Amino acid sequence: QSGDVLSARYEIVDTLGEGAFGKVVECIDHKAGGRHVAVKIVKNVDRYCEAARSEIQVLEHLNTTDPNSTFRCVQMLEWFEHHGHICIVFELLGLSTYDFIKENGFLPFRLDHIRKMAYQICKSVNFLHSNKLTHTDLKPENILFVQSDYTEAYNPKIKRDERTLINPDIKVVDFGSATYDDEHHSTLVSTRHYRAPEVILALGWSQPCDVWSIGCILIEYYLGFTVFPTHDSKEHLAMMERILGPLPKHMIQKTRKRKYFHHDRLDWDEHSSAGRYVSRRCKPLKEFMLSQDVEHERLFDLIQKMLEYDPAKRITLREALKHPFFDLLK
Numbered sequence: 001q002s003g004d005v006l007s008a009r010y011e012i013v014d015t016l017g018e019g020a021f022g023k024v025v026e027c028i029d030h031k032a033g034g035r036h037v038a039v040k041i042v043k044n045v046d047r048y049c050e051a052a053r054s055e056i057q058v059l060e061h062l063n064t065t066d067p068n069s070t071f072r073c074v075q076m077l078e079w080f081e082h083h084g085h086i087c088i089v090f091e092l093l094g095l096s097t098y099d100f101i102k103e104n105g106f107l108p109f110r111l112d113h114i115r116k117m118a119y120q121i122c123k124s125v126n127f128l129h130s131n132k133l134t135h136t137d138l139k140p141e142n143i144l145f146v147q148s149d150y151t152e153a154y155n156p157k158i159k160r161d162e163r164t165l166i167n168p169d170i171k172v173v174d175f176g177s178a179t180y181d182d183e184h185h186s187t188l189v190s191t192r193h194y195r196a197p198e199v200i201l202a203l204g205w206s207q208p209c210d211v212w213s214i215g216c217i218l219i220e221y222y223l224g225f226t227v228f229p230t231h232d233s234k235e236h237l238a239m240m241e242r243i244l245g246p247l248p249k250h251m252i253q254k255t256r257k258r259k260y261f262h263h264d265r266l267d268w269d270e271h272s273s274a275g276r277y278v279s280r281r282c283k284p285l286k287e288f289m290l291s292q293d294v295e296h297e298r299l300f301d302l303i304q305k306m307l308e309y310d311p312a313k314r315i316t317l318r319e320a321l322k323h324p325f326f327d328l329l330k
């Protein structure tokens, strides 16, 4: 649909992303000097229409409270309808953190950069949690760089050229699934690899599910790959038990997902083929650390706290923002 013109000013010039909802495109703005903006064009389908209308209402609230994007939510500039598609116009951001890592060969981010990004992500989502909202769909595809310009240098260690961001500042996008405390809470939220155990076990969720997703994001930034290479719920749980230890009994007792459990234990055979796969690919969390220096132990301390099983016990973002891991930023 490149060449189409929306609202008589925004001409499509490229596709930035795609999703359940539709697509995000880059447009030239013919009424503002040809400067470029992003536009989310939503499918003409009820569920996605209603999510976009929700998104707009959230964005108007967040933009009114924080018009300068101090807390780094993406800025909506305007919204309109076009051939029954709701279109939301945004400031143009650069690549998602996912796309940057992909294009860099799945090399992980440097720790100094991870520190800055984690801080900004926590600061943004916390702003949300302070406003009775939960995002519910945090993942690297929904954390975008403000500018994804990079310098390149030969890295002798790994015998290859690598890209380093000039500026690693980010913003959080996609408020289509965002849910106020008092609204209906969907049964299933999040993209599988970022999904908290309370969601898998259908216990109910709130702000702490976002904290779990952030835990998973930070691991991926650190390693360049997921520690939950799965598309199956019961196996995901097996993976969690290998990385983090057994699930709390009280959560197993509460759940109605009885098919995952035998007696009051995860119904998992470590000697099955799936069992080998899990044992090969997943190991205790701190065994993933690439170094033992204190900066690393502290990242991993934080991550472990974010990946607390019990959402009542899990670290809050308010508490995360004061974590020792973040001092070299002050």
Ligand SMILES: Nc1nccc(-c2c[nH]c3ccccc23)n1
Pocket: 016, 017, 024, 038, 040, 074, 090, 091, 092, 093, 094, 144, 173, 174, 175
């Ligand atoms: N709200 C929302 N939901 C999903 C994706 C985007 C989005 C993807 N790529 C972008 C580039 C610039 C501004 C926004 C986006 N935004």
